Amino acid sequence: LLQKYVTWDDKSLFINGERIMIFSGEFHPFRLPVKELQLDIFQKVKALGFNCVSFYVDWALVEGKPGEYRADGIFDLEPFFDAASEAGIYLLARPGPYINAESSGGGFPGWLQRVNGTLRSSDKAYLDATDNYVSHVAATIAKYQITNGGPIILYQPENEYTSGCCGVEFPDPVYMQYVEDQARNAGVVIPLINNDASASGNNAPGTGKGAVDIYGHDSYPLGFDCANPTVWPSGDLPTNFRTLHLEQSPTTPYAIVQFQGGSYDPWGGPGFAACSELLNNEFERVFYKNDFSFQIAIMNLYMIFGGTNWGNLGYPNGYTSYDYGSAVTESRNITREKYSELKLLGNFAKVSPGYLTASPGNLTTSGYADTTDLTVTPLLGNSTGSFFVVRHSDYSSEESTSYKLRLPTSAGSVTIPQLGGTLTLNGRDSKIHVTDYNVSGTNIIYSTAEVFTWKKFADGKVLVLYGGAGEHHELAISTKSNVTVIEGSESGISSKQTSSSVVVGWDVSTTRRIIQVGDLKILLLDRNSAYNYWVPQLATDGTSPGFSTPEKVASSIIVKAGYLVRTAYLKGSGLYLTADFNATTSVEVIGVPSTAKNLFINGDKTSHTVDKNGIWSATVDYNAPDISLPSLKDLDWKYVDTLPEIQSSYDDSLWPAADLKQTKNTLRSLTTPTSLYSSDYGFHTGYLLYRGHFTATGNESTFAIDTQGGSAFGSSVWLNGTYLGSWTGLYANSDYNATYNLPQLQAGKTYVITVVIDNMGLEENWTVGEDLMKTPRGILNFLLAGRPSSAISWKLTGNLGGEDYEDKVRGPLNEGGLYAERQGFHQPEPPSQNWKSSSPLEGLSEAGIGFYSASFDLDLPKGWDVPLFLNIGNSTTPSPYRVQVYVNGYQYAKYISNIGPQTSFPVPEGILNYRGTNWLAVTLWALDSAGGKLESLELSYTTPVLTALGEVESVDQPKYKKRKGAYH
Ligand SMILES: *[C@@H]1O[C@H](CO)[C@@H](O[C@@H]2O[C@H](CO)[C@@H](O[C@@H]3O[C@H](CO[C@H]4O[C@H](CO[C@H]5O[C@H](CO)[C@@H](O)[C@H](O)[C@@H]5O[C@H]5O[C@H](CO)[C@@H](O)[C@H](O)[C@@H]5O)[C@@H](O)[C@H](O[C@H]5O[C@H](CO)[C@@H](O)[C@H](O)[C@@H]5O)[C@@H]4O)[C@@H](O)[C@H](O[C@H]4O[C@H](CO)[C@@H](O)[C@H](O)[C@@H]4O[C@H]4O[C@H](CO)[C@@H](O)[C@H](O)[C@@H]4O[C@H]4O[C@H](CO)[C@@H](O)[C@H](O)[C@@H]4O)[C@@H]3O)[C@H](O)[C@H]2NC(C)=O)[C@H](O)[C@H]1NC(C)=O
Ligand SMILES: *[C@@H]1O[C@H](CO)[C@@H](O[C@@H]2O[C@H](CO)[C@@H](O[C@@H]3O[C@H](CO[C@H]4O[C@H](CO)[C@@H](O)[C@H](O[C@H]5O[C@H](CO)[C@@H](O)[C@H](O)[C@@H]5O)[C@@H]4O)[C@@H](O)[C@H](O[C@H]4O[C@H](CO)[C@@H](O)[C@H](O)[C@@H]4O[C@H]4O[C@H](CO)[C@@H](O)[C@H](O)[C@@H]4O[C@H]4O[C@H](CO)[C@@H](O)[C@H](O)[C@@H]4O)[C@@H]3O)[C@H](O)[C@H]2NC(C)=O)[C@H](O)[C@H]1NC(C)=O
Ligand SMILES: *[C@@H]1O[C@H](CO)[C@@H](O[C@@H]2O[C@H](CO)[C@@H](O[C@@H]3O[C@H](CO)[C@@H](O)[C@H](O[C@H]4O[C@H](CO)[C@@H](O)[C@H](O)[C@@H]4O[C@H]4O[C@H](CO)[C@@H](O)[C@H](O)[C@@H]4O[C@H]4O[C@H](CO)[C@@H](O)[C@H](O)[C@@H]4O)[C@@H]3O)[C@H](O)[C@H]2NC(C)=O)[C@H](O)[C@H]1NC(C)=O
Ligand SMILES: OC[C@H]1O[C@@H](OC[C@H]2O[C@@H](O)[C@H](O)[C@@H](O)[C@H]2O)[C@H](O)[C@@H](O)[C@H]1O
Ligand SMILES: *[C@@H]1O[C@H](CO)[C@@H](O)[C@H](O)[C@H]1NC(C)=O
Ligand SMILES: *[C@@H]1O[C@H](CO)[C@@H](O)[C@H](O)[C@H]1NC(C)=O
Ligand SMILES: *[C@@H]1O[C@H](CO)[C@@H](O)[C@H](O)[C@H]1NC(C)=O
Ligand SMILES: *[C@@H]1O[C@H](CO)[C@@H](O)[C@H](O)[C@H]1NC(C)=O
Ligand SMILES: *[C@@H]1O[C@H](CO)[C@@H](O)[C@H](O)[C@H]1NC(C)=O
Numbered sequence: 001l002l003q004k005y006v007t008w009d010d011k012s013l014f015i016n017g018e019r020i021m022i023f024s025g026e027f028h029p030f031r032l033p034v035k036e037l038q039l040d041i042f043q044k045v046k047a048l049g050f051n052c053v054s055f056y057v058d059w060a061l062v063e064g065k066p067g068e069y070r071a072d073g074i075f076d077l078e079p080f081f082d083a084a085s086e087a088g089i090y091l092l093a094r095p096g097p098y099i100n101a102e103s104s105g106g107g108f109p110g111w112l113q114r115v116n117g118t119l120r121s122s123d124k125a126y127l128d129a130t131d132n133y134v135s136h137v138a139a140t141i142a143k144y145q146i147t148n149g150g151p152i153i154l155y156q157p158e159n160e161y162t163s164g165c166c167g168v169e170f171p172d173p174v175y176m177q178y179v180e181d182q183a184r185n186a187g188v189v190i191p192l193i194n195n196d197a198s199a200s201g202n203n204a205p206g207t208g209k210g211a212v213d214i215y216g217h218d219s220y221p222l223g224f225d226c227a228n229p230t231v232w233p234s235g236d237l238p239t240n241f242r243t244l245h246l247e248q249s250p251t252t253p254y255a256i257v258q259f260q261g262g263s264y265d266p267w268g269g270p271g272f273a274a275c276s277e278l279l280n281n282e283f284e285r286v287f288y289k290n291d292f293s294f295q296i297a298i299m300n301l302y303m304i305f306g307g308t309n310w311g312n313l314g315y316p317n318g319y320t321s322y323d324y325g326s327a328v329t330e331s332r333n334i335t336r337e338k339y340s341e342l343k344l345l346g347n348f349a350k351v352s353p354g355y356l357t358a359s360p361g362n363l364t365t366s367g368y369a370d371t372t373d374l375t376v377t378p379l380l381g382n383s384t385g386s387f388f389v390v391r392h393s394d395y396s397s398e399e400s401t402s403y404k405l406r407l408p409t410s411a412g413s414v415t416i417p418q419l420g421g422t423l424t425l426n427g428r429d430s431k432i433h434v435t436d437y438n439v440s441g442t443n444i445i446y447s448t449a450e451v452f453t454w455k456k457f458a459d460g461k462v463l464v465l466y467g468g469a470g471e472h473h474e475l476a477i478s479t480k481s482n483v484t485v486i487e488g489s490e491s492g493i494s495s496k497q498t499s500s501s502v503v504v505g506w507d508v509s510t511t512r513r514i515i516q517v518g519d520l521k522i523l524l525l526d527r528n529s530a531y532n533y534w535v536p537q538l539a540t541d542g543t544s545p546g547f548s549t550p551e552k553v554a555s556s557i558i559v560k561a562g563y564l565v566r567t568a569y570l571k572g573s574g575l576y577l578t579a580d581f582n583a584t585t586s587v588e589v590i591g592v593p594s595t596a597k598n599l600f601i602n603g604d605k606t607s608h609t610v611d612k613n614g615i616w617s618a619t620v621d622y623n624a625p626d627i628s629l630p631s632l633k634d635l636d637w638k639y640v641d642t643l644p645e646i647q648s649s650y651d652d653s654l655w656p657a658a659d660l661k662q663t664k665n666t667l668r669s670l671t672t673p674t675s676l677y678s679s680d681y682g683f684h685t686g687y688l689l690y691r692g693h694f695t696a697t698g699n700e701s702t703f704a705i706d707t708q709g710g711s712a713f714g715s716s717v718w719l720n721g722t723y724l725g726s727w728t729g730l731y732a733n734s735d736y737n738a739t740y741n742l743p744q745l746q747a748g749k750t751y752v753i754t755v756v757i758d759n760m761g762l763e764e765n766w767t768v769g770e771d772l773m774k775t776p777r778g779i780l781n782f783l784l785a786g787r788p789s790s791a792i793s794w795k796l797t798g799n800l801g802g803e804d805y806e807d808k809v810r811g812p813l814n815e816g817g818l819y820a821e822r823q824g825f826h827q828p829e830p831p832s833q834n835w836k837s838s839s840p841l842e843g844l845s846e847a848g849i850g851f852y853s854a855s856f857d858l859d860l861p862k863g864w865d866v867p868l869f870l871n872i873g874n875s876t877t878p879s880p881y882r883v884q885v886y887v888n889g890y891q892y893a894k895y896i897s898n899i900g901p902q903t904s905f906p907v908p909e910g911i912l913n914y915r916g917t918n919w920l921a922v923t924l925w926a927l928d929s930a931g932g933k934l935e936s937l938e939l940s941y942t943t944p945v946l947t948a949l950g951e952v953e954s955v956d957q958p959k960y961k962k963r964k965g966a967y968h
């Protein structure tokens with residue numbers, strides 16, 4: 001339409017004139033702000049057989065100050081894009097402005113609470129507020145389009161523009177057209193794709209103004225309830241998705257822009273390990289092959305890698321972790337079985353172009369298989385091949401089911417298995433059987449066992465097939481040649497020859513078999529052996545694999561290894577692999593080019609033997625060195641009181657006054673004399689403090705207050721130095737009405753109520769019209785009994801400078817309003833040399849907030865990827881306390897003792913310096929009159945990985961420097 005690099009028809013996208021199945025994974029650059037680890041994720045995604053990544057940009061992080069767009073350093077998108085290019089990974093860009101994404105404000109900066117107009121509408125006040133952001137971020141995206149040699153192939157304007165309310169004319173075509181035009185005006189020429197929250201047809205081609213180029217929708221069919229991970233409720237497997245696609249957008253490829261790849265988890269919830277159990281390998285093979293049943297051509301898993309809600313970037317209902325139960329864990333490991341299972345399907349689709357050209361039919365409980373207990377959806381191709389997706393009719397069934405099939409082929413319609421026995425489907429599993437499947441000229445008439453991959457080498461073809469344990473399988477090949485078993489035993493290998501074919505039957509075994517039929521070798525594996533196979537692209541012009549183009553796809557090799565294979569390249573007589581290892585691993589290479597004489601692994605020449613079938617074998621030894629980690633409790637901890645506000649000497653005269661008589665928040669009108677909404681004064685993140693001055697009459701009894709900080713928030717209140725009490729918090733409370741009883745006050749004297757409130761982040765804005773992101777934070781109501789409310793004059797603070805935020809390197813959200821934070825003491829090398837010697841393990845003996853500082857050295861060995869975790873103990877029911885931990889200035893843990901569930905906090909290399917000094921800054925807020933302390937505090941590690949990754953550069957860690965604008 002506007003360029004010729006990326007086109008489409010009713011079946012699929014074309015990239016440079018060639019069909020491709022887009023298999024993508026969601027990865028957010030702002031949730032992993034170390035550029036070398038971004039590359040790691042991209043390489044792990046490519047090893048799945050994927051070819052794309054989808055990403056959000058968080059507006060709140062890059063325009064904290066209205067009018068000042070900053071996407072530099074750790075927020076720089078350019079290294080993220082170059083890393084995609086280096087890995088051979090295309091990109092779907094989704095910069096919002098609204099992104100939801102369990103992020104504070106759903107991506108909107110806190111200053112949108114002052115916008116006089118409906119958010120996500122055509123009100124000019126909202127649209128003008130978006131202009132500066134979109135023109136900058138879309139210009140950067142434009143520069144890296146595929147039209148300009150970049151990796152970016154698709155662009156998503158808005159996010160799930162699907163439901164409206166409250167007087168909004170939904171859907172508004174003027175709005176979506178303006179959003180679309182903003183991108184085009186910034187120079188975006190690539191196709192636009194939307195993500196309708198459900199398959200409702202919004203903004204599809206044919207809808208007139210505001211229509212996108214490719215209609216996409218989203219789907220999370222198993223819900224977000226990770227508490228019952230084995231429960232698959234009745235009817236939750238979609239069946240009508242193709243039907244709705246043809247009704248809603250028959251001219252564009254079938255696209256799910258966010259398909260479930262995990263789940264979010266709230267404060268107090270069951271934990272992300274439970275989420276990984278619900279969205280496990282069984283879920284993937286049943287539900288993802290079900291999407292293939294609808295001939296899905298663009299498929300994106302939200303999330304493929306989740307990362308971390310560091311520096312308060314997350315929304316109020318969620319906590320520090322965003323592991324998401326995804327295929328790649330928060331700490332970047334790929335141990336979960338769901339990673340290996342998904343690799344099998346990604347590789348299937350990477351080499352099966354016949355899938356895109358078949359004619360999908362309707363699902364059947366009869367006609368293909370001999371039992372109504374199975375459902376079979378056919379995708380019928382002519383000479384291009386056919387595909388049959390088999391599953392249990394009741395998709396939740398754990399029953400083992402025997403069956404036979406009738407499949408049409410070029411050689412007649414066959415009743416399979418021909419040579420005796422039956423096929424089996426065990427429990428929550430799904431198969432894609434193939435017919436007339438083309439292996440570069442050799443035609444597989446049929447195979448019941450699923451295809452992992454196939455390649456054409458200089459000296460013959462290889463095909464890799466697998467089945468699950470206990471299964472009997474069958475294939476047939478168009479050939480005059482006979483079948484011979486070249487690896488393994490003939491026992492269990494039955495066969496029959498005809499004039500134009502050979503039929504072969506086999507039982508799945510833990511022992512591999514290789515059979516040979518003319519110039520085709522076929523590997524017959526079990527699913528668990530296949531989990532250890534990889535298909536890196538073989539580079540000849542350099543060391544990078546390049547994008548997944550037909551030519552580079554065809555020039556790939558097959559490697560059996562362990563934990564991970566990243567890349568392969570050929571250079572003279574040298575075949576080079578880059579790979580990672582979590583144990584001593586035997587490596588086999590199939591498809592070694594004839595010009596290759598030596599094997600290098602991670603640059604190191606490695607001995608190899610060649611067996612009778614031309615397969616190179618080698619061994620990679622794993623010997624972790626001593627991983628020495630200091631004891632956190634033995635460090636030289638230094639303490640300073642970070643609530644000096646509750647001493648009578650404190651002088652708040654430099655504090656902003658909360659003296660606005662009219663709020664700019666259109667959602668909730670004032671129920672107090674002045675606005676006590678933090679965002680009216682430019683304070684959107686972290687702990688908020690309010691100070692209320694009054695002159696006592698001496699008749700004061702009680703002080704009531706309604707605090708609001710979002711779900712799981714807490715608040716504490718003092719009268720001068722007297723602790724009045726705390727709201728200790730519940731996930732179910734986003735506000736709370738306390739009543740406090742005051743001591744006997746001295747008539748004519750001045751008092752100050754100090755109030756501390758945990759701001760858990762700003763709310764999302766999912767429903768257009770509702771403006772829920774404007775939900776304020778701070779104090780909503782108060783009553784000083786017997787006195788008019790004008791008796792109290794308030795001041796407040798958030799992070800120092802508010803929207804004129806101090807830390808331009810770490811961004812607008814990282815730090816909140818505590819004294820120690822205002823002064824910048826949470827950064828490396830604070831002025832702690834004259835502080836008191838006290839540990840957070842000793843803690844506090846009265847309600848308050850303390851700040852603890854210490855450094856520690858690491859000297860971890862080069863060439864190892866070692867995930868490190870901070871651990872805060874909770875072996876027994878604790879008293880109510882709140883903890884924030886800054887690692888070299890970066891906040892990487894928020895902890896609520898009484899709500900949970902997170903006790904283990906990963907912190908990535910780059911934020912941590914593995915061969916240098918590191919700084920911990922811990923805040924400890926005790927919401928109890930007897931104080932509080934940490935039970936324990938420990939640095940731990942999980943399995944070290946022998947890695948190919950390059951040196952991880954430390955991000956910028958600005959050290960403490962005295963701040964002019966502070967209040968002291
Ligand atoms: C280095 O990197 C490696 C990756 O490259 C990494 O390896 C991976 O590790 C993870 C674990 O971290 C593996 O995932 C788990 O796998 C478990 C094992 O089952 C799988 O494998 C067996 C085959 O096992 C045999 O073969 C292997 C060799 O391949 C041997 O090592 C084994 O010892 C065993 O060998 C014997 O048998 C062989 C015969 O095959 C013999 O030849 C041999 O000589 C030996 O005698 C398969 O059979 C399994 O498939 C079956 O079950 C699955 C799912 O259950 C079905 O889908 C499938 O169709 C089959 O029926 C399977 O493939 C899994 O048990 C384990 O599953 C649990 O955890 C996940 C969450 O992590 C859940 O999704 C899942 O539901 C299970 O959760 C329950 O149980 C766990 C407890 O384990 C609880 O945590 C959880 O709360 C939940 O509890 C509930 O249900 C329970 C029911 O089980 C119940 O008991 C409870 O009470 C409760 O109600 C998980 O998937 C992964 O496979 C490895 N990947 C690879 C490629 O190897 C390695 O760890 C790294 N190393 C280090 C040090 O870091
Ligand atoms: C891949 O990435 C993943 C995400 O990054 C990562 O997963 C995370 O891994 C960390 C580190 O292991 C996990 O934190 C730990 O979790 C432990 C509690 O969970 C266990 O026990 C449950 C009991 O019902 C099991 O059900 C549960 O299994 C589940 O979770 C698995 C995740 O690994 C998942 O695979 C399974 O499928 C399953 O669903 C799990 O086994 C927790 O015990 C541990 O706490 C301690 O360890 C710390 C570090 O050593 C200590 O600092 C801390 O105090 C605890 O120590 C105590 O622990 C032991 C047992 O008591 C003792 O040996 C220790 O000495 C110590 O003992 C003290 O405390 C006792 C109190 O009970 C006391 O009685 C003792 O006398 C003594 O005082 C830690 O929090 C994290 O949960 C994982 N996150 C997620 C999202 O899954 C994974 O590791 C990565 N993998 C690789 C290879 O890199
Ligand atoms: C250290 O260890 C200690 C001691 O073991 C840990 O303390 C425990 O922490 C638990 C987790 O927070 C806590 O359980 C919670 O208690 C409250 C009751 O006061 C309860 O509300 C919680 O249950 C709901 O909330 C969680 C999410 O937090 C949901 O996952 C759960 O399914 C429940 O969901 C319902 O309520 C939500 C609240 O609004 C709803 O949004 C949700 O949809 C669902 O709605 C229903 O319930 C309402 C009630 O009927 C109803 O009106 C509504 O419409 C729906 O029916 C959860 O049980 C333990 O109490 C606590 N134990 C002790 C002894 O203190 C501590 O966490 C540990 N620390 C760390 C760091 O790990
Ligand atoms: O939780 C991860 C993402 O949730 C997405 O939104 C919700 C989801 O809910 C259901 O209505 C439906 O099954 C599905 O189609 C979706 O609309 C957001 O798009 C995303 O930003 C994350 O919040
Ligand atoms: C099989 O693939 C080759 C390309 O390697 C192609 O030339 C041939 O036409 C294909 N066969 C069919 C039936 O599509
Ligand atoms: C309470 O604190 C203020 C300073 O915040 C101080 O000037 C005032 O005298 C104190 N009132 C009493 C009764 O001690
Ligand atoms: C927004 O501006 C309109 C038009 O000038 C005005 O009528 C309305 O009262 C304003 N609302 C707020 C909250 O400032
Ligand atoms: C305040 O004044 C009332 C009389 O108006 C009296 O009954 C009450 O005891 C006084 N309260 C306190 C706390 O002194
Ligand atoms: C607190 O009281 C206010 C004022 O009536 C009310 O509107 C709000 O809903 C109450 N909050 C809770 C959590 O009960």
Ligand SMILES: [Cl-]
Nearest residue numbers: 822966967968
């Ligand atoms: Cl200050």
